[PDB]
């Protein structure tokens, strides 16, 4: 996903990602590894994938 | 900081994810998910940079 929306990946969150794309439960046991990949997942002209 | 009174509104959906991508959206006393379901008494918008 983009930058500022990484906060949305957690229980009780809401927004674009946590409402239309990918929702988590409260009774969730597990965890969330998030790390920047601009050097790979971004190219000049912007990735339209 | 500028305080704006808000009244006589159909206050629209939770994050206001129209064009502006909001970095931090952390809510005290109200869960963000329920933010649509309620009717607020005395809303005040405190804006600054």
Curated annotation (Swiss-Prot), chain B:
It comes from the Viruses. Binds to host ACE2. RBD also interacts with the N-linked glycan on 'Asn-90' of ACE2. Cleavage of S generates a polybasic C-terminal sequence on S1 that binds to host Neuropilin-1 (NRP1) and Neuropilin-2 (NRP2) receptors. Interacts with host integrin alpha-5/beta-1 (ITGA5:ITGB1) and with ACE2 in complex with integrin alpha-5/beta-1 (ITGA5:ITGB1). May interact via cytoplasmic c-terminus with M protein. May interact (via N-terminus) with host bilirubin and biliverdin, thereby preventing antibody binding to the SARS-CoV-2 spike NTD via an allosteric mechanism. Attaches the virion to the cell membrane by interacting with host receptor, initiating the infection. The major receptor is host ACE2. When S2/S2' has been cleaved, binding to the receptor triggers direct fusion at the cell membrane. When S2/S2' has not been cleaved, binding to the receptor results in internalization of the virus by endocytosis using host TFRC and GRM2 and leading to fusion of the virion membrane with the host endosomal membrane. Alternatively, may use NRP1/NRP2 and integrin as entry receptors. This is Spike protein S1. It comes from Severe acute respiratory syndrome coronavirus 2 (2019-nCoV). The chain holds residues 353 to 401 of 1273 of the full protein.
